[PDB]
């Protein structure tokens, strides 16, 4: 019943005291955070409190969309020796700091995601050459489907790959994806290995990567410029915004204190120093 | 009335009983007492084995030595208890297996010693590596130290043999080993053994994972890390030392899918 | 639905419990045929394209 938008408990008036009750004392040893209120130690007047936690509820903490990647595509001239670059990005929040740290506060979570795609383009060669408005395709290849090979092979016939066709110069594109985990919650951390090295086998085939699980494998996104070759080369970038919605979490962990290094929890040398200098005696 | 102390506790599971006089009460992690897999959240279809008493009993891991140079110690579950009688056995003979735990970290000094040990129960305790060139590379053997456990260190030392890398952990203490500030560690279920007050810690952890039941040999659920909050000093003594012993205990454990015995290359 | 360790499936195997015995003047080597299928509790999800066909050009 107590919703997020409820007023915090009104602080009671309390006067002088000389009793055997000891509020003030604890023994953090138990592990219990001593639960005192202002009125417990000092004298308080009555106060009708109006502040509510409404803007810090799990929902609101993740309520902002966030950049997750920068995918590069381009459409060079047909005369060019280099091949028309189509980008393929594996879907993982771990590619950028920002969302990851916000997600790390929790061991597990269930969240239906909403993706937004802002696509910006530009010329490269200093030619007063033109280019007609381009049309992009963002194809979601789920784990195991054939990943595109050429900017123009069959794979793009999207028989079943849910795709999006975005014309440039229009409002950014957006799609909703429900919770797609193979579990009951997405694992932000996986302690263990996929393969158990067996006693009657080669170490090679018995070896995997620590903290690498399928739990967080979700296929790739394929992006290409649909318009064919154009005399004047035009590169473009596709920024992907992810905003977790209908979110819920489990088990708090301490926030990441030193610069992240790679997909694991691992850290690099030099970066292991977070706090600064300050004196024990200077306020 | 009958002087029942929150210092005098008695834990009993299976054929063992651990009493205690200087306890700091006990913590039931997250406020959920362990329990058997429900039918609402059941998953695998075959009948589940419930070893009960044959498994629900206090096993004692090997004791460690607490000194001034002790930086910390760490143990994974069910890992550590992989050689513990039937629970050790029932662990290898199944694909799936969920289990709770009751960790009773004992360690006493005397009114003349001082210091503080924080027993933390980190769910999904992923530890950091030793090489600064290769991520998440640590090998299985190193990752699962068993009943002996591994230890924290005062400084990060990179693994420089790229010919034959050590592939082990090198967890730096103040960073709770996984690049986070220790001072915050207090968010996971825990208790502090402060030599002046108590001589044991008691955390009861209910199975916590992303699945209903999972592979034991593969994925470690819990992580018990013990770090010295306040260093150990005694008398006017240059070399004080008191031992710390962990006695863990599986609870409400159940396994599914009997097969042939798994023999893991532990070395 | 792909080759993955984490979510591997297991192994099926067939072994002679006894041995196949035949009387005299009978083919000494006979064969078996195997069939697979889903039970009533089988279900799939999240449609994707297939690797079992390709149109080159």
């Amino acid at each position: 019943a107590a919703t997020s938008r409820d007023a915090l408990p009104n602080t009671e008036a309390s006067g002088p005291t000389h009793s055997k009750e000891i509020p003030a004392l604890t023994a953090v040893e138990t592990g219990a955070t001593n639960p005192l209120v202002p009125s417990d130690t000092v004298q308080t007047r009555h106060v009708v409190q109006h502040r509510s936690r409404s803007e810090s509820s799990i929902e609101s903490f993740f309520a902002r969309g966030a950049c997750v990647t920068i995918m590069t595509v381009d459409n060079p001239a047909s005369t060019t020796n280099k091949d028309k670059l189509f980008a393929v990005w594996k879907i993982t929040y771990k590619d950028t700091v920002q969302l990851r740290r916000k997600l790390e506060f929790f061991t597990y979570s269930r969240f239906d995601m909403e993706l937004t795609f802002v696509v910006t383009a530009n010329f490269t060669e200093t030619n007063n050459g033109h280019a007609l408005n381009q049309v992009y395709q963002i194809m979601y290849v789920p784990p195991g489907a054939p990943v595109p090979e050429k900017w123009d092979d069959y794979t793009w016939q999207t028989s079943s790959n849910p795709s999006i066709f975005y014309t440039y110069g229009t409002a950014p594109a957006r799609i909703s994806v429900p919770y797609v985990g193979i579990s009951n919650a997405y694992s932000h951390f996986y302690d263990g290995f996929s393969k158990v090295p067996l006693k009657d086998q080669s170490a090679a085939l018995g070896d995997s990567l620590y903290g690498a699980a399928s739990l967080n494998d979700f296929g790739i996104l394929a992006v290409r410029v649909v318009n064919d070759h154009n005399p004047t080369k035009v590169t473009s970038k596709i920024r992907v915004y992810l905003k977790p919605k209908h979110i819920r979490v489990w088990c708090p962990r301490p926030p990441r204190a030193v610069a992240y290094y790679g997909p694991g929890v691992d850290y690099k040398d030099g970066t292991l120093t977070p706090l600064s200098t300050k004196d024990l005696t200077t306020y | 009335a009958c002087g029942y102390s929150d210092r005098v506790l008695q834990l009993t599971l299976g054929n063992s009983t651990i009493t205690t006089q200087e306890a700091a009460n006990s913590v039931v992690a997250y406020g959920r007492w362990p329990e058997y897999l429900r039918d609402s959240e059941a998953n695998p279809v075959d009948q589940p084995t419930e070893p009960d008493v044959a498994a629900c009993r206090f096993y004692t891991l090997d004791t460690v030595s607490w000194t001034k140079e002790s930086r910390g110690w760490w143990w994974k579950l069910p890992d550590a208890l992989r050689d513990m009688g039937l629970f050790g056995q029932n662990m290898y003979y199944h694909y799936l297996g969920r289990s709770g735990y009751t960790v009773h970290v004992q360690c006493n000094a005397s009114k003349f010693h001082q210091g503080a040990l924080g027993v933390f129960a980190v769910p999904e305790m992923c530890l950091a590596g030793d090489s600064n060139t290769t991520t998440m590379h640590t090998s299985y053997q190193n990752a699962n130290p068993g009943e002996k456990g591994g230890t924290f260190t005062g400084t990060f030392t990179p693994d420089n043999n790229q010919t034959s890398p050590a592939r082990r952990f090198c967890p730096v203490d103040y960073l709770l080993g996984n690049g986070t500030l220790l001072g915050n560690a207090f968010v996971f279920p825990h208790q502090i053994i402060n030599l002046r007050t108590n001589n044991c810690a008691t955390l009861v952890l209910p199975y916590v994972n992303s699945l209903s039941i999972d592979s034991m040999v593969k994925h470690n659920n819990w992580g018990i890390a013990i770090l010295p909050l306040a260093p150990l000093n005694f008398a006017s003594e240059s070399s004080p030392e008191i031992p710390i012993t962990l006695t863990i205990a599986p609870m409400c454990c159940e396994f599914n899918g009997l097969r042939n015995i798994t023999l893991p290359r532990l070395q | 639905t792909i080759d993955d360790s984490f979510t591997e499936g297991g192994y099926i195997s067939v072994f002679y419990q006894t041995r196949i015995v035949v009387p005299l003047s009978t083919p000494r080597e006979m064969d078996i045929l195997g069939f697979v299928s889903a039970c009533n509790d089988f279900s799939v999800r999240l449609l994707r394209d297939t690797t079992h066909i390709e149109q080159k050009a």
Epitope: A87, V88, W89, K90, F193, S194, K195, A204, L205, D207, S208, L209, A212, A213, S214, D217, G262, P263 | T133, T134, T135, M136, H137, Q162 | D3, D4, S5, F6
Partner: nanobody, 126 residues
Framework: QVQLQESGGGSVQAGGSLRLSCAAS????????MAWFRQVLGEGREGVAF????????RYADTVKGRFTVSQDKDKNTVYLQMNSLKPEDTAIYYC???????????????????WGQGTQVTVSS
């Protein structure tokens, strides 16, 4: 298709040290399992050392192990092969293959390798 632009052979004598560079053209990220090889003149076409793109873990061939070290240029998509102690028998047409990957499984020889390199030959004179 992934392209593996290799570089750059030569027949220096015993004990020598050269190196091969091979690009991801290609989309080096989580996929490719950049491996090394050398075709022992018609005998002959063995796998030298192989690196994992995702983590940077190397494995070598029982022959090359130690002398040869596989290096990785993550950001500029190149995988090197510091060919050390080049002895006369280090005469063979070198290779650079790169397959895909198993999410978490280490890049080994029994695993890859879908795509092929140029095959730039390095010979060790006698």
């Amino acid at each position: 298709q992934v392209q593996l632009q290799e570089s750059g052979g030569g027949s220096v004598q015993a004990g020598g040290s050269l190196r091969l560079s091979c690009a991801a053209s290609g989309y080096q990220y989580s996929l490719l399992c950049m491996a090394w090889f050398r075709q022992v003149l018609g005998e002959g076409r063995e796998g030298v050392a192989f690196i994992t793109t995702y983590n940077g873990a190397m494995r070598y061939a029982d022959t090359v192990k130690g002398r040869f070290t596989v290096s990785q240029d993550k950001d500029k998509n190149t995988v090197y092969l510091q060919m050390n102690s080049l002895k006369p028998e280090d005469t063979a047409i070198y290779y650079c293959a790169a397959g895909r990957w198993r999410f978490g499984d280490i890049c080994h020889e029994g695993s890859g390798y879908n795509y092929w390199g140029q095959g730039t030959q390095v010979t060790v004179s006698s």
